[PDB]
Structures are given as structure tokens and as C-alpha cells.
Amino acid sequence: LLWTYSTRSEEEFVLFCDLPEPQKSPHIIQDKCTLHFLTPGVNNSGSYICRACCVKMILEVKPQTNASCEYSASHKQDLLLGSTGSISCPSLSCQSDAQSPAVTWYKNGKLLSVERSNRIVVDEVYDYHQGTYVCDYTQSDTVSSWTVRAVVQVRTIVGDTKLKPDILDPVEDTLEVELGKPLTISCKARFGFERVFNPVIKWYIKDSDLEWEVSVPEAKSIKSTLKDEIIERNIILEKVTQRDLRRKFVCFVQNSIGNTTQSVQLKEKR
Amino acid sequence: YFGKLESKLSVIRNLNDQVLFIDQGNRPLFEDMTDSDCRDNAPRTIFIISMYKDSQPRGMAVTISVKCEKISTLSCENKIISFKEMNPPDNIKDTKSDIIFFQRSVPGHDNKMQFESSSYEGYFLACEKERDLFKLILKKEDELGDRSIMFTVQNED
Amino acid sequence: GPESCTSRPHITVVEGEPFYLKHCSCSLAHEIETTTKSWYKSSGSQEHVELNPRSSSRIALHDCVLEFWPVELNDTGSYFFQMKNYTQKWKLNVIRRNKHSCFTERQVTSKIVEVKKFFQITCENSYYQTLVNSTSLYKNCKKLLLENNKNPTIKKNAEFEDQGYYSCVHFLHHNGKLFNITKTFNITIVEDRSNIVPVLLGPKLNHVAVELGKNVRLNCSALLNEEDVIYWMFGEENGSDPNIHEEKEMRIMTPEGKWHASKVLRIENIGESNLNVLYNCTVASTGGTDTKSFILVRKAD
Ligand SMILES: *[C@@H]1O[C@H](CO)[C@@H](O[C@@H]2O[C@H](CO)[C@@H](O[C@@H]3O[C@H](CO[C@H]4O[C@H](CO)[C@@H](O)[C@H](O)[C@@H]4O)[C@@H](O)[C@H](O[C@H]4O[C@H](CO)[C@@H](O)[C@H](O)[C@@H]4O)[C@@H]3O)[C@H](O)[C@H]2NC(C)=O)[C@H](O)[C@H]1NC(C)=O
Ligand SMILES: *[C@@H]1O[C@H](CO)[C@@H](O[C@@H]2O[C@H](CO)[C@@H](O[C@@H]3O[C@H](CO)[C@@H](O)[C@H](O[C@H]4O[C@H](CO)[C@@H](O)[C@H](O)[C@@H]4O)[C@@H]3O)[C@H](O)[C@H]2NC(C)=O)[C@H](O)[C@H]1NC(C)=O
Ligand SMILES: *[C@@H]1O[C@H](CO[C@@H]2O[C@@H](C)[C@@H](O)[C@@H](O)[C@@H]2O)[C@@H](O[C@@H]2O[C@H](CO)[C@@H](O[C@@H]3O[C@H](CO)[C@@H](O)[C@H](O)[C@@H]3O)[C@H](O)[C@H]2NC(C)=O)[C@H](O)[C@H]1NC(C)=O
Ligand SMILES: *[C@@H]1O[C@H](CO)[C@@H](O[C@@H]2O[C@H](CO)[C@@H](O[C@@H]3O[C@H](CO)[C@@H](O)[C@H](O)[C@@H]3O)[C@H](O)[C@H]2NC(C)=O)[C@H](O)[C@H]1NC(C)=O
Ligand SMILES: *[C@@H]1O[C@H](CO[C@@H]2O[C@@H](C)[C@@H](O)[C@@H](O)[C@@H]2O)[C@@H](O[C@@H]2O[C@H](CO)[C@@H](O)[C@H](O)[C@H]2NC(C)=O)[C@H](O)[C@H]1NC(C)=O
Ligand SMILES: *[C@@H]1O[C@H](CO)[C@@H](O[C@@H]2O[C@H](CO)[C@@H](O)[C@H](O)[C@H]2NC(C)=O)[C@H](O)[C@H]1NC(C)=O
Ligand SMILES: *[C@@H]1O[C@H](CO)[C@@H](O[C@@H]2O[C@H](CO)[C@@H](O)[C@H](O)[C@H]2NC(C)=O)[C@H](O)[C@H]1NC(C)=O
Ligand SMILES: *[C@@H]1O[C@H](CO)[C@@H](O)[C@H](O)[C@H]1NC(C)=O
Ligand SMILES: *[C@@H]1O[C@H](CO)[C@@H](O)[C@H](O)[C@H]1NC(C)=O
Ligand SMILES: *[C@@H]1O[C@H](CO)[C@@H](O)[C@H](O)[C@H]1NC(C)=O
Ligand SMILES: [Cl-]
């Protein structure tokens, strides 16, 4: 069995052991006898053995010159939760689907008997539809009728948010502080999921028209879920003094929708 | 420890839109009903979903009841579904309970609901076709994507 | 194969439609012995007249069913089945057909579908499936162009244009006469009804300074949904405390349709027991929970 891999700017690949009885079932990762190849180029090509019964695999790699069509499928695909989605084979997208050229699909190793077309059309998408999808099809030449393997990674995602972010911490518009002591105020903000995500979380200091920008320290994603993302960024005062009372410390946060601010006025515990 | 918070009048339905109801045999069943039939078959079709506080929070703690003649609460005791002749309790002096369920939305499907038992973890309220009728049973999560454990809760809010 | 018995006690049907009544405890398995099955009808105060199995009449009694070819306005009444160690009843109510239409208003099954989310109409029938000649789909009583097989279906991501009444008709022939079974769905499309996973504002652990004798007002705010509940836990299991009062929650809706809820815990005449003990506040949703703890520490620490 000889499989071909037509690489580009960014992709992935796998080679699983095929045998009559599912008895059990290098810098590149290995899991459940299914050896995976990450970021190769022109290197990862040749014969690979797995084991009396011996599963022979003669891999081949070559770079793709250019896309045969305008709407050439991605190797990273997104299925919206609760709607109708499709998992199209990148290696067979530009030919559309005149007649399915013997397409076999594999979701996380397991074969998909029903799906044999250029596309897997998922009627109603649920979280479990997520996974590594491998579309295989045989293409003949002079003597060898080698198979073509393409690996599409699909994720189940919720539609992009229609809401601006939320400042979790701080809440109170004031703060009891003792002068001559250090202070580190923390800004915690929750960001609704977006396909293209460019969040903003920064502190700034203002005294009427006067404004000072804080750049250090770096922001930190504390939690990332399906619906939201929490990022945190501190402000450090090595020694709070009388001047730090004349001004307000405002945390700024913004996503593709808009911005929300929480300004804290410092007061002494006294 | 559970503490009864509040209730809502709801109509529970499966994903093939079959209305949940308590028959004369006093057993919880599923059946195809027109809006008219569902209305005309009340109070059997209208359920009292009561929310509870939890000493160890782990999702929406809930009780499911029906006021046919008197109020009856849903029990999953001995992994078997039944309607016990009782009003939702004001307090439950235990971490786990045969009448308390965790009402949880399915990822990305915010209006589809799943009820896991607080007493038997891994087991959920589900609709299973047994012979000539659709029973409301309690079954262990066997395979990913099981749509028989999903439901829709139409509130009177 | 099998078929759902009519378990529901009250049944509404429209005149001129072939309708049936199937009793429960019906097992047609080869091991099952034959037995005497009786069907009776009641009209008004009391009747209890045994149903007539006349020579190919409008009413057909066989196996487990009471078929009607078709139901008419005068069929409304109380029906009863009797068997060895088994008795079932139903309250049949047959409503008038909307003649100046294709479907009757009352026999509608409403469904609300979210925009850009999977929408489907599957025109199926299994009981009368063997007798069905042709099947059609109607949007506001206007026929739909399709492949129109034994079951014409719709399968698309919902759009406000899909809102409407979908009459699903099944034409069949019964020993010469043509009948039809019509089942209409009242589909109404509605804008993103997506919920937020609730969250408590502020840090997860709070040390709230105070000295004995005085009172505290622990405030717990939450970003939640409309239907979500916010509560406090302070040892109700050990009995009731007459110094801890849970004030009525406050709710506001942010211009962008965001709900904020605030509930405060009043702790009157702080004693040594009220110290170094975790007073938890939590949010509860169908889509998640979040908990916050408030420890009462002496002002002297
Ligand atoms: C499923 O099966 C049922 C029967 O079980 C069928 O029901 C019949 O359907 C028709 C139409 O829905 C019923 O309505 C009758 O319509 C007549 C007028 O329709 C014509 O004229 C208008 C003019 O504007 C046209 O638009 C239209 O296309 C028609 O050409 C009315 O005249 C009838 O009213 C009364 O007067 C007549 C005499 O003129 C009497 O004979 C009638 O009895 C009645 O008193 C009436 O409104 C008809 O009533 C239904 N019959 C029965 C027995 O219920 C369904 O059509 C069928 N489903 C499908 C999809 O075919
Ligand atoms: C994949 O697609 C990319 C485009 O997205 C493609 O890149 C283009 O390659 C061609 C060559 O194959 C480039 O064009 C040539 O550029 C050289 C200078 O670098 C010129 O000397 C050439 O001029 C001659 O030919 C012209 C056209 O016939 C004549 O008009 C002229 O008088 C000269 O005789 C010629 O213009 C082109 O610049 C790139 N463009 C980009 C954006 O990369 C790439 O080659 C494709 N892959 C493969 C393997 O073909
Ligand atoms: C108030 O809340 C505390 C803490 O509760 C925990 O933290 C919150 C922020 C949430 O994440 C909660 O979901 C979570 O329960 C309650 O006390 C804590 O309870 C947990 C669960 O019973 C204890 O964990 C166990 O500890 C034992 C012994 O170490 C282990 O063997 C177990 O594996 C398990 O981890 C935890 O120890 C306990 N912590 C404290 C500080 O007591 C507390 O009961 C509650 N109070 C009231 C009045 O409701
Ligand atoms: C098809 O489904 C829709 C709902 O999706 C039903 O429409 C609803 O009908 C009522 C009719 O009264 C509408 O008005 C309401 O009336 C009450 C009367 O007490 C009043 O208090 C309310 O303020 C309101 O005005 C309601 O707005 C309407 N909703 C929508 C979204 O259309 C319709 O009845 C269903 N059809 C059938 C045949 O069942
Ligand atoms: C759908 O029905 C037609 C017509 O059926 C006739 O009319 C009915 C009201 C009832 O009286 C029936 O018994 C009649 O047969 C079917 O068309 C007939 O097909 C046969 C061959 O199968 C042919 O010999 C007849 O001439 C046809 N009748 C007419 C009026 O032309 C048709 O086959 C049915 N289709 C399906 C898919 O069930
Ligand atoms: C943050 O959001 C505010 C609005 O809430 C933005 O303010 C607007 O700015 C435009 C100019 O870009 C003005 O025409 C509007 O009048 C402003 N609105 C108000 C109410 O002041 C602000 O620009 C945003 N900031 C950033 C950094 O994007
Ligand atoms: C509990 O805290 C919340 C949040 O700080 C308070 O609620 C809001 O306070 C802001 C102050 O800027 C007002 O603009 C809002 O209108 C308030 N909203 C609500 C829903 O109340 C709340 O008042 C605090 N309660 C107590 C008693 O301290
Ligand atoms: C294989 O070749 C690629 C360049 O195409 C290189 O980056 C990689 O390090 C090589 N791997 C090994 C194992 O030599
Ligand atoms: C009921 O209505 C039908 C209409 O076709 C009629 O044939 C039948 O005789 C009526 N039955 C009685 C008891 O009047
Ligand atoms: C009568 O039927 C019920 C079930 O409906 C069964 O439990 C009972 O044992 C039966 N009794 C006899 C005498 O057959
Ligand atoms: Cl959010």
C-alpha cells in the first residue's frame, strides 16, 4: 500500500496499521499504533513497517504548486454547533463532485461506511463530531494505483459573540489602601468566543485630560472554554504614595464588538 | 444538603417532539401530541420543575413533579423510574438523592437538556421505546451522541 | 413494527380523516395467545354500547385497533377497551374541518426554531404507510416543489423566511374511496436565543474584616441569564441561625441584554462562631455554576 501527501504552507498527516484482525488497535508523535507526522515538508517519505503478518506502507511526499480553484478547502475546519455543516476533502475540493472518485473517510482511526463522497455532510452538529478526519482515495498511473491521503482537523465551535467583554475583577469603583506600601491591582476579563480573536486588556492611569499608559507586565489567559476566554493583567505600584490618590486607575478591555472599562479610585484605609 | 429554592411550570418533550406525561397507570410516558391535545391533557402534561440549593454545587439541582389529583415527585430509586406520592421536599439532608437531578444544557445546544442522577452518577433520564410504548427510564451513558438522554423544557415564563 | 398505543386519555381529531385507537399491553408476538377483546362507546350521561363490527362499515375492529374510515363529528365520545385482566378508556373529541382552508387551526403542533440552526420537516407516517398513494408538503396551504417521494423532507439551516404553517398531507385509498391524513406544524423562527455561562464578579476568596458585636453585609454579584438563580450557603443543615438573613436579590438588564443579579447576606451581631467559617455564594444555570467564599476575619486579624 502506497499513499501520497501533497504538502503546502501548513498541514498534518497520519499512517495507521491495517491488518485482518484488530488485535491491538523519531521526533514525530505516535499514538494507538497510528503514527502521525507534524510539519515535515519534503523529508517524511518512504517505507514504514508495522507488526507472521506484516503491514507494508510506502509513503511519498511532494509540495503543492498552487490551488486548482478559488474556493480550495482548508486543512483546519470549523463546524458550528447545532446547525448543518460539512467536512470537505481538501485533496478533492477543486474537482467539486461530478462523480465521487472512491472516497473513504476515517474519523479518529475508525472507518465511516456511509460517507463515501467528497464531503461529509453533518445534518445537526454536536460536540462529539470534533476530531481528526482522514479522506483516502485511490488514483491510478502506469503500473501502481497508489492512494491519496489528506488529513483535515475539525472543531465544533459556537457562533461568534454579539457582546462586548466583561470585567470580572475589579467590581468596586474604589479601594482601601495604606500609603507607603506596595499594591498590585488585578484585572480579570471574560471574552465571548470569536473565530478571529484579537482581545485587548490593558491598564491606564488618568488625571483629568492627563493619561499614562502601563505596558508591563504581560497579560495571561487563565481559562479557555467553549463559549468564553478569561484573560488577566495586573498593574504594579511598588510603593503607593499621596499622588496615587489624586488619580484613577482604569482597566481597559475590548473585542470585535466594543469596549468596557472599570476605573478604580484609590482611598486610604485611615 | 439541598434546599428548595423555587419552581416553574414546564412541559418536558423529547427530540422527536413527544410530550412527557403521567398516564392513568400513573407511569411517566412519551406520546405525539398536537398543541390542543397537550393543553386538553393537562395537568398530566404540565410538570413542576423545582430548583434546589446545593452544599456541593455541581450543576442545577432539580426535582420533577405533577399535580394530577395530589403532587407526585419523580424518583430514580433502585435505578428504576417511579412517581412517589409526595410534594417536593423543603430540605434534603444528603449530598446525593434519588429524587434530585442535575439539569444541564448540552455543549452548543443551550435549549436541549440532560438530567443526570445525583445518586447514580453516569445514569441519565432517557426515553426508551419498550414494546408498544415510550417509557421515561433511567439509563447509564452508553455511547457519545445518545439523543434519547436529551430533552426540551418549555416554560410558562 | 411495533406501533405506539394511544396512552394519552383525551384525543382530539378532525372529521373526514382516517383515524385509529390502539390499546396498550398489545403484544402480537407469535407466543401470544388469542383472546376476546371488547370495545364500547358512551354518549352523554351513560350509554356503554358495544362497538359494532358491521360488514365493512365506517368502524373497523381488528388485532389491537379500532379503525375509523373516517372519523365524523358524531364519533365524539368516551371509548373503552376490555380484555382478560385489562381495561383502557379514552375521551374522543372530533372537531370541525376548516373547509375554507387545507388544514384546521386546532390540530397544529407548534415548534420554535433558532435562526442559522438546523431546521427539518420529515413528512412521515408509519401506521397508514402501506395504504399511502402520494404525499405532499404545504407552506401556508401552497404546495411545495420537491422530488415528492413516499416522504418529502426539508433539511436546511433556519432563516426567518422559513416561518409559517407546514401542512403535511398523506393521500391514501381505502377499498375504493380516497382519504388524506394532514398534520400541520406551526414553525416560528426566532433570533439567537444563546445563553451565557454564569460567573460571580470579584475574587473567588474574600476575607471580610469586622470586629464582634457589629453587623456585616456580604454582597455577591453575578453576571447570569434571566432564568438563573443566585443563592447563599451558611449551614442550614446544622439547623436555623437567627442572625444570618439572606436579603431579596436585585436584577438589572444592561443595554446589550446582559443580566446582573445582586444578593446580600446580612450577618447580625457577629460572634466567635461567625469567624473563620466559609459563607459560600453560588450562581446556578442549566449551562453552569460558579461559587464564591466569604471568610469573616477579625479587624485585628
Ligand atoms: C382531505 O380530505 C378532505 C375530506 O375528508 C378534503 O376536504 C374538502 O376540501 C374542500 C376544500 O378545502 C372543502 O371546502 C369546500 O369548498 C367549496 C369551494 O371551493 C371551491 O371554490 C372556491 C371558490 O373561491 C375555490 O377557491 C376552490 O379552489 C374550490 O374550487 C365550498 O363550496 C364548500 O362549501 C359548501 O358548499 C358546497 C356547495 O357549493 C357543499 O357541497 C359543501 O358541503 C359545503 O357546505 C366547502 O367549503 C370541503 O368541504 C371538504 N370536504 C369535506 C367532505 O370535508 C380535503 O380537501 C382533502 N385534502 C386535500 C389536500 O385535498
Ligand atoms: C504558483 O502561483 C504563483 C502566483 O500566485 C506563481 O508565482 C509567479 O510565478 C511567475 C513565474 O512562474 C512569476 O512571473 C515571472 O516573473 C519573472 C521575474 O521573477 C519575470 O522575468 C517573468 O517575465 C517573463 O514572462 C512574462 C509572462 O510570460 C512576460 O510578459 C515577460 O516579458 C517575461 O518574458 C514572469 O513575469 C510571477 O512573478 C510569480 N508571482 C508571484 C506573486 O509569486 C508560482 O510560480 C506558481 N507556482 C508554480 C510552480 O508555477
Ligand atoms: C463552602 O465551600 C467550601 C469549598 O468548596 C469548594 O470550593 C468552591 C470554590 C467550589 O469549587 C466548590 O465546588 C468546592 O466544593 C466547602 O468545603 C470544601 O468542600 C470540598 C468538597 O467536599 C472539600 O474537598 C474534599 O476534601 C477532602 C479532604 O481534603 C478530599 O479527600 C476530597 O477529595 C475533596 O477534595 C474541601 O476540602 C472543602 N474545603 C474546605 C475549605 O473546607 C464548604 O463545605 C462550603 N461550606 C458551606 C457552608 O457550604
Ligand atoms: C402559532 O404559534 C404562535 C407562537 O409561535 C402563536 O402566536 C401567538 O398567539 C397569541 C394569540 O393571542 C399572541 O398574542 C398574545 O395574546 C395574549 C392574550 O391573552 C396577550 O396577553 C399577549 O400579550 C399576546 O398579545 C402571541 O403574541 C402570538 N405569538 C407569536 C410569536 O406569534 C399562534 O397562536 C400559533 N397558532 C396556532 C394555530 O396555534
Ligand atoms: C395512486 O393511485 C392511482 C389511482 O388509483 C385509482 O383510484 C383510487 C381512488 C382507487 O379507486 C384505486 O383503487 C384506483 O386504482 C394509481 O393508478 C392506477 O395504477 C394502476 C397500475 O398500478 C393502473 O392500472 C390504473 O389505471 C391507475 N389508475 C388510474 C386512475 O389511472 C397509482 O398506481 C397509485 N400510485 C401509488 C404510488 O400508490
Ligand atoms: C470605546 O468605545 C467608545 C464608545 O462606547 C468609543 O467612543 C466613541 O468614539 C467615536 C470616535 O471613534 C465617537 O464618534 C463617539 O462619539 C464615541 N462615543 C462615546 C459615547 O464617547 C471609543 O472610541 C472606543 N475606544 C476604543 C479604543 O476603541
Ligand atoms: C452589590 O454590588 C453591586 C455591584 O457593585 C451593586 O449594584 C449596582 O451598583 C452600581 C454602582 O455603580 C449601580 O449603578 C447599579 O445600578 C447597581 N445594580 C444593581 C443590580 O443593584 C449593589 O447595589 C450592591 N448592593 C449592596 C447592598 O451593597
Ligand atoms: C526534515 O527536513 C525538514 C526540512 O524540510 C527539517 O526541518 C527537519 O528538521 C528534518 N527532520 C529530520 C529528522 O532530519
Ligand atoms: C355519523 O356521521 C356519518 C357521516 O357520514 C353518517 O354516515 C353516520 O350515519 C352518522 N352516525 C349517526 C349515529 O348519526
Ligand atoms: C394483571 O395485569 C398486571 C399488569 O397490568 C399484572 O401485574 C398482574 O399480575 C395481572 N394479574 C393477573 C391475575 O393476571
Ligand atoms: Cl461574556
Numbering used by the authors:
A (entry chain C): 30 to 54, 102 to 127, 138 to 356
B (entry chain A): 1 to 157
C (entry chain B): -2 to -1, 20 to 318
The authors write:
This proinflammatory cytokine is secreted by various types of cells and strongly augments IFN-γ production in type-1 helper T (Th1) cells and natural killer (NK) cells following activation of NK-cell cytotoxicity; thus, it plays a critical role in inflammation and the host defense against microbes. We determined the crystal structures of IL-18, the IL-18/IL-18Rα binary complex and the IL-18/IL-18Rα/IL-18Rβ signalling ternary complex at the resolutions 2.33, 3.10 and 3.10 Å, respectively.
The IL-18/IL-18Rα/IL-18Rβ signalling ternary complex is formed by IL-18Rβ binding with the lateral portion of the binary complex. On ternary complex formation, the IL-18/IL-18Rα binary complex structure essentially does not change; the root mean square deviations (RMSD) for the backbone Cα atoms are 0.41–0.90 Å compared with the asymmetric unit (ASU) molecules. Site III of IL-18 comprises the prominent β8-β9 hairpin and β11-α2 loop, where the aromatic ring of His109IL-18 forms π-π stacking with Tyr212Rβ at a 3.4 Å distance, which is surrounded and stabilized by multiple hydrogen bonds. In addition to these interactions, IL-18Rβ-D3 extensively contacts IL-18Rα-D3 with the buried area ~550 Å2, to which both electrostatic and hydrophobic interactions contribute. Notably, the NAG-NAG extended from the IL-18Rα-D3 Asn236Rα and points to the receptor C-terminus in the binary complex; however, in the ternary complex, the NAG-NAG chain changes direction and points to IL-18Rβ-D3 within the distance possibly to form electrostatic interaction with Val257Rβ and Asp259Rβ. As a result, despite the same ‘left’ binding mode, the spatial arrangements of the subdomains in the IL-18/IL-18Rα/IL-18Rβ ternary complex differ somewhat from IL-1β/IL-1RI/IL-1RAcP with Cα atom RMSD values of 6.64–6.73 Å. Our data show that IL-18Rβ-Y212A did not bind the binary complex, which is consistent with the structure, wherein substantial π-π stacking were observed between Tyr212Rβ and His109IL-18.
